[PDB]
Amino acid sequence: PHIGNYRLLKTLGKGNFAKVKRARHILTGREVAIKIIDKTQLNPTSLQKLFREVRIMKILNHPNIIKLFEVIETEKTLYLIMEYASKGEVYDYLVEHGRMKEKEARSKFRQIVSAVQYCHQKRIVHRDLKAENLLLDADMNIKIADFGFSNEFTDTFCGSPPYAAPELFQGKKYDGPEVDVWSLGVILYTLVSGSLPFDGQNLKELRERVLRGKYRIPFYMSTDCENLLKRFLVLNPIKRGTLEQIMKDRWINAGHEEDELKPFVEPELDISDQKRIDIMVGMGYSQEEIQESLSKMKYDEITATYLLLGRKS
Numbered sequence: 190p191h192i193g194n195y196r197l198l199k200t201l202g203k204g205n206f207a208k209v210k211r212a213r214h215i216l217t218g219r220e221v222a223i224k225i226i227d228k229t230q231l232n233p234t235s236l237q238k239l240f241r242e243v244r245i246m247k248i249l250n251h252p253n254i255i256k257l258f259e260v261i262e263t264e265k266t267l268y269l270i271m272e273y274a275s276k277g278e279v280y281d282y283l284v285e286h287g288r289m290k291e292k293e294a295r296s297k298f299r300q301i302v303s304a305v306q307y308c309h310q311k312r313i314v315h316r317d318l319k320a321e322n323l324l325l326d327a328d329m330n331i332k333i334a335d336f337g338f339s340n341e342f343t344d345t346f347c348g349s350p351p352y353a354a355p356e357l358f359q360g361k362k363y364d365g366p367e368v369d370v371w372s373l374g375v376i377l378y379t380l381v382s383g384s385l386p387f388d389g390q391n392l393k394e395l396r397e398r399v400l401r402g403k404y405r406i407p408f409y410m411s412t413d414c415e416n417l418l419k420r421f422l423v424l425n426p427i428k429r430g431t432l433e434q435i436m437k438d439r440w441i442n443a444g445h446e447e448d449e450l451k452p453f454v455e456p457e458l459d460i461s462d463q464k465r466i467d468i469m470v471g472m473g474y475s476q477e478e479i480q481e482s483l484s485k486m487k488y489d490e491i492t493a494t495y496l497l498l499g500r501k502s
């Protein structure tokens with residue numbers, strides 16, 4: 190079971206027309222995650238959605254967002270070779286361990302807010318932020334995943350209802366980032382409490398609770414955490430805080446002297462490490478080939494080998 194330079198191993202999950210498998214890169218030995226998409230079952234609008242997702246992944250380069258390494262395409266199948274996060278979904282972690290202490294939620298939430306604010310810098314809204322789409326790497330760092338429902342902000346999608354902003358329930362047109370801000374308030378509440386702030390026995394009950402916007406504050410929750418939730422979970426999207434403003438909040442930065450959370454500054458990608466390039470020449474690729482794939486940033490077998498050589502094993 191090979192595809193390109195990858196040996197396919199255990200399945201991580203499976204869904205509508207796709208599965209994700211862990212894999213090993215043969216040339217470097219690094220582990221990756223590969224999404225395998227059966228294109229034959231997709232209609233032309235699903236196909237267009239797929240290629241948009243790929244385009245979004247190429248735009249985004251952040252240490253708390255799953256990175257794209259390579260695209261392999263046949264006429265029947267699309268393979269997205271991605272960063273692997275070995276400790277699974279935040280959702281499953283909360284189920285096993287219960288709520289995080291605020292100091293543990295804070296470390297994760299700073300990473301989440303940095304990643305999503307950076308998406309908004311790039312004019313991308315995720316639109317399906319939920320505990321299930323936050324992965325954890327071997328060091329318990331957050332990696333946001335699955336931009337299959339994401340879009341640019343300049344359709345009639347509504348994500349997981351418990352995380353959906355009230356304007357989505359009323360069927361209202363919406364700009365973009367404000368709905369991610371609301372979902373991040375729901376995420377903060379789930380990290381600190383282990384439960385959702387709005388729930389119901391059915392969609393009607395859940396919808397009514399979201400629109401009322403009331404949620405329970407546990408006795409153990411600090412005043413500063415409660416006040417921060419108020420900046421996310423604002424019914425009026427016009428008055429909802431922006432993430433750049435929320436980054437200055439007291440709770441976000443408690444115990445982070447000299448390290449106030451700030452918008453991420455994307456570094457210039459080094460495509461010129463000759464030690465890595467020397468290794469790839471020894472593997473068989475020519476110097477000129479490596480230069481052309483890296484400069485056009487082709488997400489092909491070469492640029493993926495270069496990136497993976499830049500990561501641990």
Ligand SMILES: C[C@H](c1ccccc1)n1c(=O)c(N2CCNCC2)nc2cnc(-c3cnc4cccnn34)cc21
Pocket residue numbers: 201202203208209222255271272273274275277278281321322323324334335
């Ligand atoms: C495929 C799916 C998935 C894909 C995208 C976003 C979230 C979840 N998935 C599950 O469904 C799941 N299940 C849920 C049902 N109960 C058993 C555990 N566990 C997972 C654990 N690790 C990953 C993972 C790790 N490195 C990466 C890099 C890219 C993508 N995925 N990925 C994905 C998982």
